[PDB]
């Protein structure tokens, strides 16, 4: 592991310093269907006409990115994504830009969001949830080791692949930072107390978010929920959590340590780092190496009928792609 990561850091650093640029054109792909939507764009299932391969192309409208002040975060997303490589992270295949937009072509993950399956199903059994959690544990260990913070863990950002394994997408808030950071980022339900309290934070927020994930998967709902974000923020800083009556003891205690308001008592941020988590009783049966190798028994395989099948995804109105006669935000995105 330490040995593995050491090699890993070397590869990441090479790419970090020398990021790739404009590795394709819009006209090499065939736009097929929107798989998901956002604020400054949408993700489309596309087909590389020369190869016959399918990918998920994220399209960002430069003006909306600027209007929303997300330039640096956008630069971070692409720079980080092209440099990382782990089994549970989406692969960025190509990236390019044009007069109007920024494009990130990634590997198409056919299984759909964890969110949609969790919703339909209700809740996952502890064993099922642990299968998923362990993958996020290995991913954060990999990411943090590279001085990166993810900052947006939630079911919507976890995709299930053909093998029933996880693929973490959406690196729009990911940041390589040595030391504290201050941006108010993320999704309300998953926000750490330090973030809502505007105090400057680190990696420990990723470990709080993990606690929120495991809990939502196992119970079917988030530990703190209300109808408006402020009511949620209130609950989070309250430092009070109620556990469903079906949570195992090992789970109630793993969760009490992950959802530790006091980040000097929060697992993942302690003396033994991630080991405090891997060595926890709830994970006693987990064979970390086996999971990393994907040689484990996936409890559920979403099944898709042939390539390009998008039935595990929701339908969205097709907003049409427009590209200006004039370059739009040249200097802001020159490194893209």
């Amino acid at each position: 592991v330490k040995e593995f990561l050491a090699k890993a850091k070397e590869d990441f650093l090479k790419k970090w310093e020398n990021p790739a640029q404009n590795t394709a054109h819009l006209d090499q792909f065939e736009r097929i269907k929107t798989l998901g939507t956002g604020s400054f764009g949408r993700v489309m299932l596309v087909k590389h006409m020369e190869t016959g391969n399918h990918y998920a192309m994220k399209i960002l409208d430069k003006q909306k990115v600027v209007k929303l002040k997300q330039i640096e975060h956008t630069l971070n997303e692409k720079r980080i994504l092209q440099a990382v490589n782990f089994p549970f992270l989406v692969k960025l295949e190509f990236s390019f830009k044009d007069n109007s937009n920024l494009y990130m072509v990634m590997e198409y993950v056919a299984g759909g969001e964890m969110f949609s399956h969790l919703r339909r199903i209700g809740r996952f059994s502890e064993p099922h949830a642990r299968f998923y959690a362990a993958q996020i544990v290995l991913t954060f260990e990999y990411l943090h080791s590279l001085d990166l913070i993810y900052r947006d863990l939630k079911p919507e950002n976890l995709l299930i692949d053909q093998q029933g394994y996880i693929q973490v997408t959406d690196f729009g808030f990911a940041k390589r930072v040595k030391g504290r950071t201050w941006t108010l980022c993320g999704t309300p339900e998953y926000l750490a107390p330090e973030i809502i309290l505007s105090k400057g934070y680190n990696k420990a927020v990723d470990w709080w978010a993990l606690g929120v994930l495991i809990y939502e998967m196992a119970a079917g709902y988030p530990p703190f929920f209300a109808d408006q974000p402020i009511q949620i923020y209130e609950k989070i800083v309250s430092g009070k959590v109620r556990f469903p009556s079906h949570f195992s003891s090992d789970l109630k205690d793993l969760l009490r340590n992950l959802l530790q308001v006091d980040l000097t008592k929060r697992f993942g941020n302690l003396k033994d780092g991630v080991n405090d988590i891997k060595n926890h009783k709830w994970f006693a049966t987990t064979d970390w190496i086996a999971i990393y190798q994907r040689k484990v028994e996936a409890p559920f395989i979403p099944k898709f009928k042939g390539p390009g099948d998008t039935s595990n995804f929701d339908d969205y109105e097709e907003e049409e792609i427009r590209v200006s006669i004039n370059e739009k935000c040249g200097k802001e995105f020159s490194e893209f």
């Binding site: 929303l68 002040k69 969110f115 919507e156 729009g172 808030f173 993320g186 929920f225 469903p244």
Partner: peptide, 20 residues
Amino acid sequence: TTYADFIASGRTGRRNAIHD
């Protein structure tokens, strides 16, 4: 039950991230 309360709540769909 909490589950019922969550189901009747306004935040059961896909949650958007907060920027500014």
